[model samples]
Target: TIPHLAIDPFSLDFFDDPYPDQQTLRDAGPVVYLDKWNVYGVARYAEVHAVLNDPTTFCSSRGVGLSDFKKEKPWRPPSLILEADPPAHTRPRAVLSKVLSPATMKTIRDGFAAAADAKVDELLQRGCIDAIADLAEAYPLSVFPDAMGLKQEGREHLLPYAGLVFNAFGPPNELRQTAIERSAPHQAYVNEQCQRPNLAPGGFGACIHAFTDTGEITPDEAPLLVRSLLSAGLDATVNGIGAAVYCLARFPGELQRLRSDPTLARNAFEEAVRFESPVQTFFRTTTREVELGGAVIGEGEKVLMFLGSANRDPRRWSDPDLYDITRKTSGHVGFGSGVHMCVGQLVARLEGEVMLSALARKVAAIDIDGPVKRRFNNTLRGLESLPVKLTPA
Candidate 1:
């Protein structure tokens, strides 16, 4: 019998860098019963995708976070939709997704890129800039907040609001605590605009309210679900776009390749998502005893899916660790897999391509100034700040 492996759910070292340990667990077994966390985890691509899709067996209703909503204390109600499955998950996702359709995204495409180009040009003139704060953090924070049609006060809370929501998915620890304390003062304001007339009618927010009016989802659920869209849609993309820029700069030859072909912008974004998955780990609970690699899992046990490691598992790809911008990583779980996959993915892809393509047009070369400061997030793999020098085209 394989001994139950021990994994600390909270540690800055774990938060600071989780990839190496993710490699260790994946190599150990296809699925390991984490006795400590009382869950079964899959670190391989195939298994992770299967578990994500069959929500009936691996229901998220138990609270997609660490707490089991049925018996223990839960951290807020699980995301109305992110934690819901089936009939509950259907209409809201459909209505909001329609509201956020490709044409809607296309309307803002070039404008997004244009804003990024202008910002890059302004920063290059300064001879240095913090890529995260100046470009990545600034871009989407401006765009989606306005698209949501909230007042300046209500909109400004999106990042801090998201930072806490994402952290709350992990174990109750200092990192989670800090985020809650920071966001506590602002959540009410954020929640207030998530409902009713405060959100502009004829916008996506109004459509979510319509679902509440139709009795499909509760009036109580409507605001939180809208909050989920607002939260999930922003910061991760900012961090991701910033990281892709950092990677492109670190690999100058790749930057030249992107510069020569403006059309590879979509591929550039996809490749970046595959290489450094922004949302690193998420949980899935097993409804019944499931076997994997000759291991057994009991009913109602949760699994910690390490998406970042699976992206680089040598067993899954050729030269897995290399950041090849040309690679087709459509199978990747960088955006989560199956039904729970990111609905706003097109939004993120468009946002990333906009920034990357914009920079390619104006910046001839990008060189880093010093070591980057990484944000120690329990779930998000992000750099807090990245400084760089750019040359004009």
Candidate 2:
């Protein structure tokens, strides 16, 4: 018998604390039917990984959200990369991969590191601060926009736009509706910012536009790619950095370990991503009738892959719930896998490395001074506020 559950995964209740529900989904079976949303769920590591890797069978073109693009029109134009299937996905992906290559990350390293140092210095001086607003949101907002070559005037719109993009991935629930209502002006600002004329020369946005001249991507497609950067980049990194901070604060031994060897900053961040996955669930549509977890799934049925759950699946990781910086976090579905793996991962990792390393070298302690507030999103898991006291080294 197919394991069935009536849980509303999109509800705020689920977002408030998902680990228990995720455990239930994973324990029910390899595949479970969520009658609440009328979608099949895959929570275990093996099945999630298999579905992500087999893009040909479980395709993205139908939309990576509950609302099938085949049945419903997307609110905006689809992402040239995230929403496209093979051959169509190939060119844009290659262009973005080149644009955000590790080499490019290397070129920007010193500047990012400098910014991180300055930021840590500022936070240390403040002594008591909301880590989420003051550190996580502030740091990325300061650096990533400049890296993208976006004008500072309207930089505030980035987070709202990103919230809209991610929230739209779920069903048209209250969250999605509220996000849509408030996103109009933010969406307009983002659209204009994506245009070549508005972007600064030599920035990521400008660099993406240059590809249009080489015919690698069309003039029309170029701005959309810039839109992709706007859509995918900011919030994830902010939440990721928040996760790293939260993990370190919760586990002081890990922070001491990081302070002892600042080089472990990278591992600390990676382990945090595995422990507190920022980007949670993504849906994939079956392209054809397929056998998954011994159950036959018909073509066009939506299957929700819980990336957060998979990242913590004990079947794949030992002591999965324990936050250990020394743990090897390779193959975690935090950034997903296969061709659709987060293209901006290099930039995110660079940001994390410099920020955590800066904290390790400069701050003596990260004390949680107040109750943490959680920011709920249909697709993202992150903190709204984390008040902390920092002692300077």
Candidate 3:
């Protein structure tokens, strides 16, 4: 029998300071039942890794959240890539894999680097700024949408729509409800932008629509795939960059290390991801009866994977609580593991690396200027306001 733990992982209280409860969940055994949501959860690194890698047995098609798609209709049309299973997931995945491949990233690298450099220069002139608003959100919001071929006007809708998408992953709580009420215009704008006619040629959105010509995906499926990029892209990267800035601000020693060796920017960004997972939790449904951590979970049961907890599991990391930029953070489940691992991770990495590298080269010190405000989302962990004073190098 699974250990029944009565805890509300979705509550704002849990969102505020999750580490203690995350530690409790990780220590509670491999597979504990979350009685509050009536779902099973896996917080240990080993168990979380195993579950993510075994997509066939622990599937994604039934909805990667508390509400099973088989029984409850998704608030919006289900994402063809994020909510799909094998066979159905294959061709679309292949198309995306090619579209976001290393070669593609290479094409965009210089443009991203230039943007990061320019943004850092502007922030340095300002001296004091909200890292979340001025740096984290501003940098990505400037580059990513243009890379996707979205028009400059109305790009503001992107974040709100993404907020709604992520919050909807949890149970329909007040947060989700609030986001829904305000998401009408955002949803409409995002829907309009995903269309091929609205996408500029030679951009990622256009590339996805191009697949339709080859019959790799249907014409109808094309916009939805572009929608997938819109849905997954911005918010996570914004939070990720924010997490990196927050980590460095909290640990000035690590920031100095990054400054000393700017090449460590990539590793620093990745370590920040492992240290403070931006996308905290994801759920998987069982395709068949299987034993996990010695407890049998029946078919169709939802098992939430605490990704933030798994990244910091003492069993998988040394001094797991410590935020070290030089730490080897490979195999961290921060972006998840296996096939369904974050499809936009490469893009996210490029943005993080460029921004951090730019900061390392220019900023002498990062000081927390005032009260740091936390943004509470059920599926994502990030800051709403991170006021910081950046000393120029």
Candidate 4:
């Protein structure tokens, strides 16, 4: 029999600080049932990676949230990509894969790189700044909207809207409810911006819209694809950037390594992502009776994969708790794995590499200047504020 743990994984306390509970889950067994959410959780890397890659057995078509779309009315139209399994998942996935391909990323890299350099240049003038607000949040917000061709004035909605979507992955508690309430207007603006005519010329959003002519996406499906990028892409990049900033400040030796070999900026960004995964937890449902770890889970069971925990699982990573840029983090689930792996990860990496490399060129040291603050959400982990003083090189 599988062990049943009465852990309310979505409670504010868990969201705020999850490492202790994460270790407990990993230690309980390969698979443990959370009686609180009536969901099974896997914190080990092998099982989590298996579930993510084998989406057919652990299907996502039923909706990846606790509220199965088959059972409950979705608050919004289900994401054509994320909420879909293969056959239905193939087209949207292919479309997005093409849109965010290496060639496409390289096409936009120069523009985004310039934007990162400009933002870092401005921040260095201040010397002391909130790494989260001044650089992490500001860098992504500066470039992504323009790249996506969104109107400038309403771009503020991106972060809150992203937060709301992430929070909805949990049960309908106060945090989820409040997120829905606060983000309603922002969502409306996001909807408006995703439309075809709202897209600017030669931008990624416009490129997505252009697919209508190729019949890869219908005229109507274009907006939803655009929505997918804006909704899912921004928060991860921002949080990943925040994680990198936090990691560098905490591990100055790694920062020094980055300064000495600027190419390590990519390694530094990847290590930070592995060190503090941005997308913490995602749910998948079993398609049939499946045995895992000497326990059988019934069909239609929702299994929560604690991604952040898996990234740091000692079984999978040596010195899992250490922040080391030299470590090979290729298999980390930070961007996830398999068919549903993050399509916009290249975009996130481009931003992280550019911003970190620019900082490496101009800044010598990053020191924590004040207390750090965490941003708690059901599915994302990152800083709300990271105060730091940067020394010029």
> Quick one: best lDDT, which candidate?
2
Worst 10 residues of 1 by lDDT: 1-10
Please give the lDDT score at residue 241 for candidate 3.
97
lDDT (10s digit) by residue, model 2, range 15-89: 999999999999999999999888999999999999999999999999999989999998888999999999999
Error of 4 at 225 (Å): 0.8
lDDT of 4: 0.88
Q: Write the per-residue lDDT of candidate 1 for residues 1-393, one digit (tens) a residue.
A: 544668764577776767777777777778765766666677877677777777877888787777677778665656766888877788767756766788777666666667777777777788788888887898887677766767676566778878887888877778888887756666887778887778876555776777776666777767876787777888889878977987898789888988898788788888888888888888877677876557676777777887887787877778877777788787888888778788888888888887788877777898888778988777888888888888878
Q: How far is candidate 1 from the true structure (C-alpha RMSD, Å)?
A: 2.0
- CA lDDT, every model vs. true structure: 0.77, 0.93, 0.92, 0.88
TM-score of each: 0.93, 0.99, 0.98, 0.97
On residues 67-96, what C-alpha lDDT tens digit does candidate 4 reach at each position?
Answer: 778778887788889989998888878888
**Candidate with more favorable, higher lDDT: 2 or 4:** 2
Model 3, runs deviating above 4 Å: none
Worst 10 residues of 4 by lDDT: 175-184
**lDDT score for residue 82 of model 4:** 90
